[PDB]
Recover the amino acids of this structure.
């Protein structure tokens, strides 16, 4: 997957497993959510293209969101969209499958850097807008969470299991966006 | 309500109704959510003390969260807890009742400033820790959202209405925390 460097950034994040413990406590994530996020993995695995299609459509129908993938001339950069899509697809699986350990934290730092002006547009060597305003990363917790639900409700698992999968996904999405604030936030205020 | 200055800050926020339109779009909030957040108001009104008790208990059982209300000596500042509780109670009602207009935005800027080192501890004239790390404002989207649900499910409204109220509350909580990032985020990156 071009540009996907999970587990091989060779850069230790500015947050560690104690930070992660305290953040999991604040978002109410426990060993129960680890179980159910993993169960979500098998449910979502074969639906990733339809999830991606849904999320492409939401972004594509909103000029002020599609903006973040545009070339200077205001048109979508199709190379950029396609390359990011492959890494986004993998992130769906990673969120369910990966242990949230230091390597995971090190990639969460990398993902935040790539939304921020620090590293945006470098992974794919594209010319596009410099920064994704942080307000929209927070806002996206809702669509990224909520639009997962109908996919979770498909694979013939019990509705009770679906709800536990869904709550685990809400917590995990929130946890990640909290970490991705790091490069955006004034030093010492995170 | 001591320290509550909604509609009378006399300070225009650095975000306006166009910013709010675009943020509502990103969080999927529409006129339908305005209807259902308002309906939540009547449901939650008479339960605010029990909601507050629940949320006091969550914070109080976690030393690293109770930390934000502590005096220098590490003990909770009881004056500070009590005064903030009254403003938090009012915020529950405001979220349901208030029109999200410029006055509302101007108070969202104020609330963000009060979590941030810019204004924390000034409203109540207390000595406490300087800043609430932004990572925890994001993380709290989950408990502030999720722990509302059982309260919404009480007042004998239909479960379908409860779900719409709950989704409106999730969106509104997310929208607000996105705005409260403003004083935390490096200038030009919000
Ligand atoms: C809950 C919030 C969000 C999630 C979970 C999310 C997830 C992701 C993931 C997994 C990637 C690829 C990371 C990698 O390189 O391995 C990515 C990249 C990207 N996302 Fe987001 N995203 C979020 C918010 C946003 C928003 C609000 C936008 C605005 C359209 C956006 C636009 C982009 C762009 C343009 C890239 C490529 C950045 C680069 O140049 O490297 N994302 N996102
Ligand atoms: C979804 C996230 C949060 C929401 C909705 C929320 C809501 C509120 C509200 C409504 C107030 C009073 C605002 C006013 O002055 O009128 C407040 C103040 C305060 N909150 Fe939060 N809060 C959030 C996150 C946090 C976190 C993570 C902490 C950590 C314990 C926290 C601790 C405090 C403190 C210490 C104050 C008083 C700040 C000051 O000195 O003025 N809040 N919060």
């Amino acid at each position: 997957i071009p540009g996907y460097t999970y587990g091989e950034t060779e850069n230790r994040a500015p947050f560690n497993l104690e930070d992660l413990k305290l953040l999991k406590e604040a978002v109410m994530f426990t060993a129960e959510d680890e179980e159910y996020i993993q169960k979500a993995g098998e449910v979502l695995e074969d639906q990733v293209e339809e999830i991606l299609d849904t999320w492409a459509g939401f972004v594509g129908s909103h000029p002020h969101l599609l903006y973040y993938f545009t070339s200077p001339d205001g048109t979508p950069n199709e190379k950029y969209l396609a390359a990011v899509r492959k890494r986004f697809s993998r992130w769906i699986l990673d969120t369910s499958n990966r242990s949230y350990d230091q390597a995971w934290l090190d990639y969460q730092y990398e993902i935040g850097l790539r939304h921020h002006r620090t590293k945006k547009n470098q992974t794919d060597n594209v010319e596009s807008v410099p920064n994704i305003g942080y307000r929209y990363l927070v806002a996206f917790i809702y669509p990224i969470t909520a639009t997962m639900k109908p996919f979770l409700a498909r694979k013939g698992h019990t509705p009770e299991e679906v709800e536990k999968m869904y709550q685990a996904w809400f917590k995990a999405t929130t946890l990640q966006v909290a970490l991705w604030s790091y490069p955006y936030v004034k030093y010492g205020d995170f």
In short: Chain B touches chain A at residues 19, 22-23, 25-28, 62, 64-65, 116-117, 131, 133-136, 138-143, 145-146, 167, 170-171, 174-175, 177-179, 181-182, 184-186, 188-190 (CB under 8 Å). The radius of gyration of chain B is 16 Å. Chain B has one domain: 1-190.
